[PDB]
Amino acid sequence: EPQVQFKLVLVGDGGTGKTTFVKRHLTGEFEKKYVATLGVEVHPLVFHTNRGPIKFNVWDTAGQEKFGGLRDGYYIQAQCAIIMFDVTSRVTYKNVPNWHRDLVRVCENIPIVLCGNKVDIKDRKVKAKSIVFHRKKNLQYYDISAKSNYNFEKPFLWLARKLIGDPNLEFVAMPALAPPEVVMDPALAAQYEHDLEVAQTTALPDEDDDL
Amino acid sequence: EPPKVVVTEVKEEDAFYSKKCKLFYKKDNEFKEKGIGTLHLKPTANQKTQLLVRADTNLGNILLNVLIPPNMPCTRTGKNNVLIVCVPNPPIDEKNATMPVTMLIRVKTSEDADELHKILLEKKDA
Numbered sequence: 001e002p003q004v005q006f007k008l009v010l011v012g013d014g015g016t017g018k019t020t021f022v023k024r025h026l027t028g029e030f031e032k033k034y035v036a037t038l039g040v041e042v043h044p045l046v047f048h049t050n051r052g053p054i055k056f057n058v059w060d061t062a063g064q065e066k067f068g069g070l071r072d073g074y075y076i077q078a079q080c081a082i083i084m085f086d087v088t089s090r091v092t093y094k095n096v097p098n099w100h101r102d103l104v105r106v107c108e109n110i111p112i113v114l115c116g117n118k119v120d121i122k123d124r125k126v127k128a129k130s131i132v133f134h135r136k137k138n139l140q141y142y143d144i145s146a147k148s149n150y151n152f153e154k155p156f157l158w159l160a161r162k163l164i165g166d167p168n169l170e171f172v173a174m175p176a177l178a179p180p181e182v183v184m185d186p187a188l189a190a191q192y193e194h195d196l197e198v199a200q201t202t203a204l205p206d207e208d209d210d211l
Numbered sequence: 212e213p214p215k216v217v218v219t220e221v222k223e224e225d226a227f228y229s230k231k232c233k234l235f236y237k238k239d240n241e242f243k244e245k246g247i248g249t250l251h252l253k254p255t256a257n258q259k260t261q262l263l264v265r266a267d268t269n270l271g272n273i274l275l276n277v278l279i280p281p282n283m284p285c286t287r288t289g290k291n292n293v294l295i296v297c298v299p300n301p302p303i304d305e306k307n308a309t310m311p312v313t314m315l316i317r318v319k320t321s322e323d324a325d326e327l328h329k330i331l332l333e334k335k336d337a
């Protein structure tokens with residue numbers, strides 16, 4: 001558990017991929033199915049840096065009006081934020097200024113990153129030349145794709161540099177130290193290896209030639 | 212055209228085997244994606260071997276980190292897959308970490324999938 005931690009609030013229209021981006025950093029999962037977030041979901045993200053560890057307490061808020069409720073509670077004491085839209089949906093970019101107002105109303109001068117998601121998709125509607133919202137010193141923009149992991153760590157790296165005051169701070173990998181051995185029951189292990197050999201109830205995933 | 216994704220791979224000089232892969236874990240009745248990464252087999256101070264999977268990112272997110280137990284379920288299935296059962300570390304369900312989980316390790320080719328199945332079984336024995 002790092003001592004250094006910051007509250008980060010993540011906002012944007014529903015369907016823009018806010019939750020999918022957090023899961024990529026949290027568990028590496030990517031769910032094709034759209035399941036809207038209800039209220040807010042708070043997840044901790046730990047990053048190792050050249051100056052020590054950092055923890056972002058990410059408040060992943062719901063983007064849909066009917067699912068978000070009153071958002072002031074999610075924002076208070078937030079020390080940074082991420083605004084997100086979908087480059088395949090021009091409306092989500094039209095609403096970016098609205099999310100920016102709500103954040104500045106409750107949080108004032110916090111470092112914010114603008115992230116245009118789903119750049120992995122060919123038919124892009126919100127192109128970079130068209131994106132001109134960011135103009136200030138406390139605002140930044142990045143193209144990202146939570147599916148292809150394009151600019152994976154950029155939004156957090158920029159926030160960590162502003163929050164720590166070190167333009168040269170760098171993220172580093174976490175060492176993989178030998179874990180504890182887990183003893184299994186031999187009979188149970190035999191039963192598992194049998195269920196594997198015969199029980200193939202779950203279908204093997206489809207063979208995307210990603211590798 | 213969608214931008215290319217460039218990654219400076221996190222290297223594990225101490226590994227004696229390393230293969231790019233895609234990882235899945237069985238929950239409900241589906242194999243949920245855990246991400247593309249690189250499977251590493253590394254030495255320990257004992258004769259046991261460390262099974263490590265780092266994500267295909269600049270940060271090398273640790274998707275799996277487990278010592279290979281002697282009686283680890285290990286079976287070859289599919290075109291290019293290898294199944295195993297182990298108590299995941301890092302945990303997949305924080306509430307019930309101790310429960311073993313069935314896991315699918317995909318690799319690019321059937322031949323190199325057959326190779327992964329071989330050396331894993333070789334390291335169960337130690």
Ligand SMILES: Nc1nc2c(ncn2[C@@H]2O[C@H](COP(=O)(O)OP(=O)(O)NP(=O)(O)O)[C@@H](O)[C@H]2O)c(=O)[nH]1
Nearest residue numbers: 014015016017018019020032036037063145146147
């Ligand atoms: N092609 C593509 N699809 C993506 C990407 N990120 C998310 N999606 C998809 O977009 C949909 C919405 O994702 P989700 O993470 O739930 O978005 P959200 O903004 O958290 N929704 P809500 O505000 O209601 O919680 C899902 O079908 C998800 O798989 C991406 O980078 N590329």
Ligand SMILES: [Mg+2]
Nearest residue numbers: 018019036037
């Ligand atoms: Mg969501």
